[PDB]
């Protein structure tokens, strides 16, 4: 039995930035009131996890990263009502408390119980459930899924279809929902419109899928890695261009291919240069540009306000605008009915013990999503 | 008779930046095909005109400024069908050609025939109709209304109700439509929402009227000139605050007054610091901020993309989003139907010859709109 007891298990701990993950024996405390302890089944490698390693995203260390995942409930704390032991669940990097101003506003989803702004690396009660070699270890985005077992706040755990293939649906926990929703919920891509998507990783390709689902007439995929172009076309891109092939700035190339600019542009990389290009490539009078990529810590863009005064709309969002707890299960339901497939996004599968090799794949540009199995 | 002949009349010519206007004798060529020559009746003094004088807005000199106006058609060029001699009309700083991509797009209004982006200071055919002291004089925003007679492209002239009091409705030509529409069309202020309006000039107060018309629960007026507070309250402001009264940055003050930030913020001044404050004061998860003010030439803002990634929408627009030729007459019809009044905005009236005194009033902060009569 494990309920009510400290669990000893393996986890990938990041002790220092710019270093490999270390697979360690860790101790996981039992869940407190309104908490859920989950046995991880599958976790996807998202660029957001990598940003902590590279120093581009600040969060307290030492830490157990991981947020795109799926697992089975091992035990629940007192007061939990939305999930029970044995349920298949997907943890959520942005919670849905259902009580704050944001949760009550139908158009927003950045719940006030999030740990994204000035990260504490704890659960919502301000404390940590992990210890390793006599040291407390921080949580990440309230989820910490690079561990055989994690404890998450109930409002950051979504119950899903019991027949779900967890090794696939874990992508719905972050990458697919974010990319797809960025097109459908945030930009609100219109039928017959033109779109440009910067970045063809798991998130960007999911945005290409969203643009196609929304009925876009043209979807121009932009990436410096041409090996991603086949998958982009498979998922809906009508044209694929590599900025490295051109002598002039990519935003000028894009405007010239689109009668002055696209109706909707998306930055799904996390760089200041591409965020600028993305904003500049949407038409000055009717374009909308959505920021999806996470930018490097405390770095700023320099923009002339005239870029907006002419009629542009510049916006950003987390999770593709989806209210997390209500949205993820519906997306899983859609997946089960075959409304969309995730196979094209999952290029590599590896045991959790080979997590470092999974990050090597990400860095090499050979993988879209590598899914780790426990 | 003047039809078909060059007209000799008075106009206010700006020969150099930072210098008073020179009331001079000028010559106005007859209208070409698809052009309209208008006898001016009333013109409002908008800060945009002043920006050219101060060097904050660049346009070719020498030039006849003026764009917020109303007059009577004196003659029309071949092919003109939408107006005829004797019609009351309002010239439009942004045209509505009805044929370009932007005009066909229901969501936009920055017609491709505009002279706003990189101004040429001419009519749409690339030439000028004004001469003074043997030299050509440039047009401004295609309208040049600081003249007893001006020639404007047909797609930049709106026919209005024949019973319109021109000394009042000229404001619908720019300031009122821009401010009001910025709230109703651009931000799409919702009933029961909270708003913050930076700047209480003719445009800003019109934005306050728009927020009220849209049903906002709270409308916080922000201005360093407390003498504008009475009119802001009269027109709908629920609270009026002066940044100079605080030790804390204004965006922080605003967020603390509104549970983390307003739903809608408007910058209606034209300064980088207030554009930044306005963006920062809207709620990070559900706020929308609209830039209305024209910023100083070639100057940039420094923004951290995280400000948008959490869920904000940052946008800008000209003319409050109204398609100019179709929209202006509807606003005049609403005015004639007594849906709204413009009296509160018109604080001073002066004959055209005293245009410099009108600009002195603007600079002093004693006037909202000064209307000049011909
Ligand atoms: N807003 C959110 O809620 C949210 C959610 C998940 C991920 N993210 C962010 O989304 C971004 C994408 O994540 P991912 O997992 O898909 O990343 P990824 O690294 O797998 O994909 C990035 C893609 O961008 C391309 N690219 C990199 N530099 C480029 C450049 N200079 N020009 C053109 N293309 C370039 C890469 O070749 C790769 O195909 C990351 O910044 C991640 O942190 C945000
Ligand atoms: N987007 C458009 O289509 C459009 C149309 C018309 C005007 N404009 C621009 O709108 C802006 C407003 O025009 P207006 O004619 O109403 O101007 P105005 O000068 O009459 O009003 C500006 C107001 O801002 C206040 N103010 C100035 N500096 C401030 C500061 N630092 N902090 C707080 N308040 C400050 C002033 O006291 C004044 O009440 C101008 O930049 C104008 O060029 C834009
Ligand atoms: O990938 C998951 N989350 C993206 C994200 C992380 C931290 C802050 C904002 C957004
Ligand atoms: O006030 C009238 N027009 C505002 C404006 C002028 C020039 C460029 C953008 C906006
Ligand atoms: Zn992620
Ligand atoms: Zn909440
Ligand atoms: Zn047009
Ligand atoms: Zn104006």
Swiss-Prot record, chains A, B:
Transmembrane segments: none
Keywords: Acetylation, Cytoplasm, Lipid metabolism, Metal-binding, NAD, Oxidoreductase, Phosphoprotein, Zinc
Source organism superkingdom: Eukaryota
Enzymatic reactions: all-trans-retinol + NAD(+) = all-trans-retinal + NADH + H(+); all-trans-4-hydroxyretinol + NAD(+) = all-trans-4-hydroxyretinal + NADH + H(+); all-trans-4-oxoretinol + NAD(+) = all-trans-4-oxoretinal + NADH + H(+)
Cofactors named for this entry: Zn(2+)
Chain positions found as N-acetylserine: 1
Annotated binding of Zn(2+) 1, by residue: 46, 67, 174
Positions of post-translational Phosphoserine modification: 22
SMART domains hit by this protein: PKS_ER
EC number: 1.1.1.105
Single GO biological process annotation from the record: retinoic acid metabolic process
Gene Ontology molecular functions: alcohol dehydrogenase (NAD+) activity; all-trans-retinol dehydrogenase (NAD+) activity; zinc ion binding
A single Gene Ontology CC term: plasma membrane
Family to which this protein belongs: Belongs to the zinc-containing alcohol dehydrogenase family.
Task performed by this protein: Catalyzes the NAD-dependent oxidation of all-trans-retinol and its derivatives such as all-trans-4-hydroxyretinol and may participate in retinoid metabolism. In vitro can also catalyze the NADH-dependent reduction of all-trans-retinal and its derivatives such as all-trans-4-oxoretinal. Catalyzes in the oxidative direction with higher efficiency. Has the same affinity for all-trans-4-hydroxyretinol and all-trans-4-oxoretinal.
Subunit structure and binding partners: Dimer of identical or non-identical chains of three types; alpha, beta and gamma.
Extra facts: There are 7 different ADH's isozymes in human: three belongs to class-I: alpha, beta, and gamma, one to class-II: pi, one to class-III: chi, one to class-IV: ADH7 and one to class-V: ADH6.
PANTHER family linked to this entry: ALCOHOL DEHYDROGENASE, ALL-TRANS-RETINOL DEHYDROGENASE [NAD(+)] ADH1B
Name of the protein described by the UniProt record: All-trans-retinol dehydrogenase [NAD(+)] ADH1B
Origin species: Homo sapiens (Human)
